């Protein structure tokens, strides 16, 4: 029954592809040709953060657009005050190898994780006066690549065991598991309504899950290599994926398509971090060429280059109010651009 | 122009920077290593020996100091077979200790392939490899005794002969050392096929219970630090 099952699975895949082609009436470039280009955007390094020891591997902006948490391979989780460059907290880590960090929307907790298989949630608003490990989650069998906060009690995490997990922090157990990916899940982005989230893995596929149901609704495959970053459009009906080849592709949820791709013949290295502006007109992508590129998310034209890092940009985030974009590379430095 | 709260916050930031610099001194002084190998190869034995003599957890860190210098050996466990993604975390380590079991010739070939993945990696182009040809008493016994001809797996063994090299000082059967060096020949050929900056392989013929492994690691790390000094200090 294996052969007939494979044949009918291929038939279903062909039907899905045919429906996708039949829904592709026009290209986003043709529709966007009528509107004016955004022009050159010359962002400058307003602030630099130079307190870390080793390569910075992740960062996350707060809801207040004031504090940002940064994770480095030395075992340090530093919370920076962007306006004044001061350091609020310097949390040591039990495991030095950290690949992701998340800042809770309420600001009370901060998440970290990496090769230690454990998502460590730290409490910053303790009445006891010090930052302590609020809880350690140890249900994964692979390196944690991205953890994101839904609320103060629920977290969503992606690991290298080709699975994602929704945890209840108080109980400490996996409330829900997502086991559709066939490769290492490296990125994770939550929708603004916190009901769906897209996970990008190394199988050149980005999968849209449902938090409250547990199954997978859409699977977008348009890349020919790994996927390292993924980020929702502010609308929530689209997202952008950065890949190990120099292509950033924008997918739409409603049509289940590949709206348009951003690639240049002069860029060869892969993309590490992808984020959008508040409007969604600008897409900032960090590269291994030691610099970041801003693309016009509707015209697929490179609107500018950050070009302020001496090593590969690993993390890149945009504040909720759209005030600034913070980029961190494998140098000890984290730079804020405006 | 700063207020009382702002000045106190700046003072707290300076205090944080003090501990950050204190930790930076140790981190720069500390020497970081990565231990890689298959389940067949003797890897838990080596870490157990160096811990005695000096769950689903992922990373295991082993402090061990020799000649008053510390080594932070990192073992990656509870991870999938595909290592091409988390290995990017180890561009700053001093060396990669690759342990290969020389007794089992059936799985030896794929081990070489794994070595290639470590050597021909776009991220470990500067990272040197300290290769450990482990489980040699088993090799010794395997080759001295009959019925496990090397030629059954590698056709080039018949056409290979021992060179004018350093035979071990104690008594060693010439065919045993011939096979023992032939195994090293493939690894060094892979190492020298594509060489980059500070990218050299240090092969050591070792045993799991041998107590000199820490000394070999210390010597190889001394050579690697020598090379990175010659590069960092303006000499090359």
């Amino acid at each position, epitope marked *: 029954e294996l052969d007939q099952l494979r044949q009918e699975a291929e038939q279903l895949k062909n039907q899905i592809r045919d429906a996708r082609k039949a829904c592709a009436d026009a290209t986003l470039s043709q529709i966007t040709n009528n509107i004016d280009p955004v022009g050159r955007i010359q962002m400058r390094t307003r602030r630099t953060l130079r307190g870390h020891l080793a390569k910075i591997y992740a960062m996350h902006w707060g809801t207040d657009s004031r504090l940002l948490v940064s994770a480095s391979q030395d075992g340090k989780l530093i919370i920076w*005050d962007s306006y004044t460059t001061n350091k609020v907290h310097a949390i040591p880590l039990r495991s030095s190898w950290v690949m992701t960090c998340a800042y809770a929307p309420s*600001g009370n907790y901060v998440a970290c994780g990496g090769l230690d298989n454990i998502c460590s949630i730290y409490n910053l608003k303790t009445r*006891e*006066g*010090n930052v302590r490990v609020s809880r350690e989650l140890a249900g994964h069998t692979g390196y944690l690549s991205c953890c994101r906060f839904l609320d103060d009690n629920q977290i969503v995490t992606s690991s290298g065991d080709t699975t994602c997990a929704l945890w209840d922090i108080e109980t400490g157990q996996q409330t829900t598991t997502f086991t559709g990916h066939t490769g290492d899940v490296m990125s994770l982005s939550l929708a603004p309504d916190t009901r769906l989230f897209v996970s990008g893995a190394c199988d050149a596929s980005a999968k849209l899950w449902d938090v409250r149901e547990g199954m997978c609704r859409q699977t977008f495959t348009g890349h020919e290599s790994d996927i390292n970053a993924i980020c929702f459009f502010p609308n929530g009906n689209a997202f952008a994926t950065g890949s190990d080849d120099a292509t950033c592709r924008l997918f739409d949820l409603r049509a289940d398509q590949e709206l348009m791709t951003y690639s240049h013949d002069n860029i060869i290295c892969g993309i590490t971090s992808v984020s959008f502006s508040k409007s969604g007109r600008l897409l900032l992508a960090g590269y291994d060429d030691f610099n970041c590129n801003v693309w016009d998310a509707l015209k697929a034209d490179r609107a500018g280059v950050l070009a302020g890092h001496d090593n590969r940009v690993s993390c890149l985030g945009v504040t909720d109010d759209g005030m600034a974009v913070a980029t961190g590379s494998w140098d000890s430095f984290l730079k804020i651009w405006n | 122009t700063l207020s*009382a*709260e702002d*000045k*106190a916050a700046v003072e707290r930031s300076k205090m944080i920077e003090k501990q950050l610099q204190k930790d930076k001194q140790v981190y720069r002084r500390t020497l970081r290593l990565l231990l890689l190998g298959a389940d067949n190869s003797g890897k838990s034995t080596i870490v157990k020996q160096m811990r005695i003599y000096h769950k689903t957890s992922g990373i295991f860190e082993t402090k061990f100091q020799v000649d008053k210098v510390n080594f932070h050996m990192f073992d990656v466990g509870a991870q999938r077979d595909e290592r091409r993604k988390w290995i990017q975390c180890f561009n700053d380590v001093t060396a990669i200790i690759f342990v290969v079991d020389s007794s089992d010739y059936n799985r030896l070939q794929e081990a070489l392939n794994d070595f290639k993945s470590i050597w021909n990696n776009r991220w470990l182009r500067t990272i040197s490899v300290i290769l450990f040809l482990n489980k040699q008493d088993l090799l010794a016994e395997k080759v001295l005794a009959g019925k496990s001809k090397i030629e059954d797996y590698f056709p080039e063994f018949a056409r290979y002969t021992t060179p004018e090299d350093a035979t071990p000082e104690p008594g060693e059967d010439p065919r045993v050392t011939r096979a023992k060096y032939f195994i090293r020949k493939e690894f060094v050929d892979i190492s020298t096929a594509s060489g980059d900056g500070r990218h050299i392989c240090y092969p050591h013929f070792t045993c799991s219970v041998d107590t000199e492994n820490a000394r070999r690691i210390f010597n190889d790390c001394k050579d690697i630090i020598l090379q990175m000094n010659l590069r960092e200090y303006n000499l090359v």
Partner: single-chain antibody
Amino acid sequence: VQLVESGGGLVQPGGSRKLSCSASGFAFSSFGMHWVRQAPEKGLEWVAYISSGSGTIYYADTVKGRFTISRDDPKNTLFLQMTSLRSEDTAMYYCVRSIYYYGSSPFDFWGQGTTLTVSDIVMTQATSSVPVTPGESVSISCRSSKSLLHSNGNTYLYWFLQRPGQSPQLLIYRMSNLASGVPDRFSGSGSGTAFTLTISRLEAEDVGVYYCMQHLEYPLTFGAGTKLEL
């Protein structure tokens, strides 16, 4: 968190003493500390402040020079050398805990305090006593001689409630932020040189004396203190 002071008693004038405050539970090394003295028939008054790391030691203008003060982080104990005792120092001395960062809440915990008996910016409260009935909202307002709106964007006034026979407890910090562990009914508002605190649906166990502070620049002068009774 516990923060208990000791070293009180009858003192002959012109003598010396050591007030020792012991901390238990919280990170003393990461927290700054303050001393506040309250006369039997008067309000609060700032005495001294020690920053984390002992890199910033500030004293009150009215008493500068005649106190020594230090901290012992390994012993988690803060020492205050009382020197040149005067009759104006006849007051209960309270220990205050404060950490300073973005979003922090300084002046959280106040110790029980020890009585000691021997043989600038000014803020004033319009009313020193308001007769109120439980269940009715009450407004306590105080004014300052200087505007507390710093250029950063937040006003540094703090509100404290002292119940009869109890240590003062923080209610509102920075004129708009509600302290931890206090009922949501309290609120604070106002603008330059005029701040007010509103207690909606007044309940039991909230009567006492209310003070409003300043933190733009040392010294941190207190208010007269509005007394609220049933």
